[PDB]
Design a protein around this ligand. Structure first.
Ligand SMILES: [Ca+2]
Ligand SMILES: [Ca+2]
Length: 279
């Protein structure tokens, strides 16, 4: 299948070179996989989700996304127009308040929640969790992210937006999960993206169009936008039988576009998420 005039990052992920505008993907489109978006929530009524999204848990007064950040990320995973995995199932877990902020004990609780809740849901092709959040190093946060991964969920986390080594941020610094850096439309590392040996992969994160609250859309930037391209891609590959939750990050790295990016510091992987689609 082909989506013409796609957002650039969806094109980038199905091409060996930059500058194309068509997203080429298999029709299966992540059908039968599930992605948990652990964030500010998801506006599930947005037309672009087509009834495929729902809130399953909130740690605040309401389950509503009063911010937009979670809706945007969810959109890049699995919205019709803006998503990598256009037929996946989205579940929203609200660990961040409507200012985009959250305590570490709540974030941890949210990851433990997903590990359990997945056993109650029908996800025959597998389970993915997208965590477009982070702060300073915490061994407990890293530990929760490790638990979620070892549960059998493909965990994808943002590297962070400090133009620094990701080793000092969590859950970015947990080795066992899939730590995602950001690139721009010219195949440069995004000027804000963290880097370092703990990064596993890069994805598109500068000027990413996606769904917003109030039924709208908008284009924002960050490692937060790169993470759901990778989470979506994982879902899409698992539905294809190409990989499993335990090895998806490694599979994505082994099948990535190698060496295309510029401004990658020495010791950081130069690998950009790629679907390898061939009609
Ligand atoms: Ca190339
Ligand atoms: Ca890793």
């Amino acid at each position: 299948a082909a989506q013409t005039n796609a957002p650039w990052g969806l094109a980038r992920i199905s091409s060996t070179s930059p500058g194309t505008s068509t997203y080429y993907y298999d029709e299966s489109a992540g059908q039968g996989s599930c992605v948990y978006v652990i964030d500010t929530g998801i506006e599930a009524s947005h037309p672009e989700f087509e009834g495929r999204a729902q809130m399953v848990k909130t740690y605040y007064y309401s389950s509503r996304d009063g911010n937009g950040h979670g809706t945007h990320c969810a959109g890049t995973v699995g919205s019709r127009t803006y998503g990598v995995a256009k037929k996946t199932q989205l579940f929203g877990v609200k660990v961040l308040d409507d200012n985009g902020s959250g305590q570490y004990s709540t974030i941890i609780a949210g990851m433990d929640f997903v590990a359990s809740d997945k056993n109650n849901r029908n996800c025959p092709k597998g389970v993915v969790a997208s965590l477009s959040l982070g702060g300073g190093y915490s061994s407990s946060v890293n530990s929760a992210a490790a638990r979620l991964q070892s549960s059998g969920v493909m965990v994808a986390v943002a590297a962070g937006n400090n133009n620094a080594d990701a080793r000092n941020y969590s859950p970015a610094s947990e080795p066992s999960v899939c730590t995602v850096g950001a690139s721009d439309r010219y195949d440069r590392r995004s000027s804000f993206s963290n880097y370092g040996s703990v990064l596993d992969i890069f994805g598109p994160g500068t000027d990413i169009l996606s769904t917003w609250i109030g039924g709208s859309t908008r284009s924002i930037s960050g490692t937060s936008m790169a993470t759901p391209h990778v989470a979506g891609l994982a879902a899409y590959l698992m539905t294809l039988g190409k990989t499993t939750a335990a090895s998806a990050c490694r599979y994505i790295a082994d099948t990535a576009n190698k060496g295309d990016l510029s401004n990658i510091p020495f010791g950081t992987v130069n690998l950009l998420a790629y679907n390898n689609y061939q009609a």
